Amino acid sequence: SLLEFGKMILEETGKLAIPSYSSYGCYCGWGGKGTPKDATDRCCFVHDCCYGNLPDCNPKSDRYKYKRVNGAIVCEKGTSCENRICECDKAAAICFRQNLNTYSKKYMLYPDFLCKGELKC
Ligand SMILES: CCCC[C@H]1C(=O)N(c2ccccc2)N(c2ccc(O)cc2)C1=O
């Protein structure tokens, strides 16, 4: 669910998911068009695509369980959907962490009209 993904992001990057990643670029937050602006935006694009591979799951509300094994994120056994949602979130958190060095404030509150393009998953 969104609440856990948010905590996963905070633990991983030290940034509050809601500011930092809820209105960033073309794909972080709500998005469905254009070419990802940078690496972080690409993390969100791939994250959206990951959820897209799970048509019958509900990522926002379905809660999963995960633990930290010395920093490593380990998804615990749950329903099929819960397991797959957790893996999608884990990947996004790591991706955000790997690209913190290029995160830019100029992409925060990015205007919709500047997201022009076609990028298939
Ligand atoms: C702390 C969470 C950061 C997560 C980021 C995300 O993965 N989704 C997201 C992506 C796909 C399905 C559901 C939620 N949304 C998002 C949330 C609310 C909203 O009305 C629109 C988009 C996000 O902000």
Side-chain angles (χ1 to χ4, degrees):
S1 64
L2 252 48
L3 269 253
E4 323 169 69
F5 183 39
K7 177 157 290 302
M8 194 180 278
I9 292 178
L10 176 55
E11 306 179 318
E12 200 75 10
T13 69
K15 288 182 171 296
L16 290 171
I18 288 264
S20 300
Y21 300 98
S22 53
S23 70
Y24 187 102
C26 297
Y27 292 87
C28 297
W30 239 154
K33 299 181 180 182
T35 305
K37 301 268 73 179
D38 64 2
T40 293
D41 201 15
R42 288 196 282 283
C43 295
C44 293
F45 177 72
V46 177
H47 186 249
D48 292 330
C49 290
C50 199
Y51 280 178
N53 300 314
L54 312 172
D56 285 354
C57 296
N58 294 276
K60 305 237 303 175
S61 55
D62 200 353
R63 320 230 294 205
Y64 53 77
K65 297 291 185 177
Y66 80 87
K67 58 168 164 176
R68 316 289 312 207
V69 173
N70 254 53
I73 298 176
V74 182
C75 293
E76 294 172 297
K77 185 182 183 61
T79 64
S80 184
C81 276
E82 283 160 5
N83 298 334
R84 294 140 72 193
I85 291 165
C86 183
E87 289 300 331
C88 286
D89 287 358
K90 172 182 180 179
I94 286 170
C95 190
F96 290 147
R97 179 68 253 282
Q98 196 165 191
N99 293 295
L100 265 181
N101 57 173
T102 57
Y103 180 102
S104 175
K105 298 202 238 85
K106 75 175 183 177
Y107 287 126
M108 295 179 83
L109 298 178
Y110 200 68
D112 174 284
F113 81 111
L114 291 179
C115 296
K116 181 287 166 300
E118 40 170 288
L119 208 193
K120 193 167 70 174
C121 290

